[PDB]
């Protein structure tokens, strides 16, 4: 799919071109989810290991909520880029090959005559 694109960075995570895109707001609901996803991992661990669920490993709880979140910003930063490349790529083609994607005129309903099936 998107691989084989000109300029593809053969093994890079997020090419610098992704600098142009806005950075993910740290409180983006998603990163906040990853946070909660993380807290739960932590709590779950405590549970499976039979420790006071919430009052234990308060250091770990932090490692978790802060590892998942850290991961998020840098992942979302990329997935965001990938999607952004997709448009660059998609929109460009629509133009470079214009005839294939022609603008269409939609007749005002006045003109079009969709048939009327009566419910009766």
């Amino acid at each position: 799919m998107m691989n084989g694109r000109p300029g593809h960075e053969p093994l890079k995570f997020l090419p610098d071109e992704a600098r142009s895109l806005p950075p993910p707001k740290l409180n983006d609901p998603r990163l906040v989810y990853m946070g909660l996803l993380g807290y739960c991992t932590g709590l779950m661990d405590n549970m499976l290991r039979m420790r006071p669920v919430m009052r234990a490993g308060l250091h770990r709880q932090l490692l978790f909520v802060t590892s998942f979140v850290f991961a998020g910003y840098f992942y979302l930063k990329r997935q965001n880029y990938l999607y952004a490349v997709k448009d660059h790529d998609m929109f460009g083609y629509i133009k470079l090959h214009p005839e294939d994607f022609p603008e269409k005129e939609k007749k005002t309903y006045a003109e079009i005559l969709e048939p009327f099936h009566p419910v009766r």
Binding site: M34, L37, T41, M44, D45, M47, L48, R49
Partner: protein
């Protein structure tokens, strides 16, 4: 194992898939497959129980002949194109061989007989490696060659696997074999979308790995190879009962959990490509897989099976804990669905 040997083997079992993935000269891809075959056989017979020798001798013969067939495809290509690698021009039969062969190493469809049996005689641990770090290698070879393979065969092996996996699983009561059967099924979905959108194969795999790896480390936490054995989970370790429940329903496609995404996007991609015949039948028997998953749910969680008196003794003693990976791979798996858009 003299720790040195452990290192050499483990390195090979790990250099095996990695060479396959990194190289482009098919030959070097073949030897990557060859190493994996050589490295896995020692670990398979670690207990050296009579069942084990049977396992390895089957795994080895099935793996070896497939390896030879893959080499024949490379040898034939070399004469139809001087290149040592499949190209647009490749004779169709040349590629189909590679599909069958690689579908034997991965154990898909009508070649699904070896896997359930080797998964039954190997330890739970080596079971995981045999199921998930040995599927990465062959799949890599296929994913690389996707543009050229046949849409018809893949689909047939895909559908067959789904059915065989499901039907096989319904009867099985041994856990190792229930998982072997599930893997056949999931492996099927993966190979269904390969011709159309390889990138989704790599999602339907990771999710399978992030689902199966927690599931097996669960089976071994109590080292239960029987459902009856996993059913007394409530006494041996009560907390894992909650997540074991969700992970197994996640392995099947039920909608709130992460497991729906692989099936959902594979169905979306197949309908985008118009296989609304094939996709429909697959999704339907996919529902058979959940039936045997939920039957296990019943025994392990929703209903409490009776336990032996000595179970009280095992409770007393501190239970060696499950590694952290269980949690991080249980949650990222049971509930990431709210984050699907970025996964795909």
């Amino acid at each position: 194992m003299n720790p040195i040997t452990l290192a050499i083997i483990y390195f090979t079992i790990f250099l095996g898939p990695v060479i396959t993935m990194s190289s482009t000269n098919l030959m070097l891809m073949w030897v990557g497959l060859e190493f994996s075959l050589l490295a896995i056989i020692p670990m398979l017979i670690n207990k050296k129980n009579p069942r084990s020798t049977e396992a390895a001798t089957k795994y080895f013969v099935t793996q070896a002949t497939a390896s030879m067939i893959i080499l024949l495809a490379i040898v034939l290509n070399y004469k139809q194109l001087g290149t040592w690698m499949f190209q647009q021009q490749t004779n169709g039969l040349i590629l189909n061989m590679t599909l069958m062969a690689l579908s034997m190493k991965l154990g898909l469809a009508p070649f699904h007989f070896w896997l359930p049996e080797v998964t039954q005689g190997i330890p739970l641990h080596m079971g995981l490696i045999l199921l998930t770090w040995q599927k990465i290698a062959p799949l890599s070879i296929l994913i690389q060659i996707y543009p050229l393979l046949n849409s018809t065969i893949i689909l047939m092996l895909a559908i067959t696997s789904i059915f065989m996996g499901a039907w096989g699983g319904l009867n099985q009561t041994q856990m190792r074999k229930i998982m072997a059967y599930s893997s056949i099924a999931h492996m099927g979905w993966m190979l269904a979308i390969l011709p159309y959108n390889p990138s989704l194969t790599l999602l339907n795999l990771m999710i399978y790995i992030i689902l199966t790896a927690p599931m097996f480390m669960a089976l071994m936490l109590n080292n239960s190879m029987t459902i009856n054995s996993i059913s007394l989970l409530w006494n041996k370790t009560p907390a894992m009962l909650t997540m074991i429940s969700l992970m197994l329903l996640s392995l099947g496609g039920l909608p709130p959990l992460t497991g729906f995404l692989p099936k959902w996007i594979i169905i979306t991609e197949l309908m985008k490509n118009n296989c609304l015949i094939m996709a429909t039948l697959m999704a339907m028997m996919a529902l058979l897989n959940l039936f045997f998953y939920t039957r296990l749910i019943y025994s392990t969680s929703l209903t409490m099976f009776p336990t032996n008196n000595n179970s009280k003794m095992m409770t007393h003693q501190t239970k060696t804990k499950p590694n952290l990976m269980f949690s991080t791979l249980a949650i990222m798996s049971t509930m990431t669905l709210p984050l699907a858009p970025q996964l795909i």
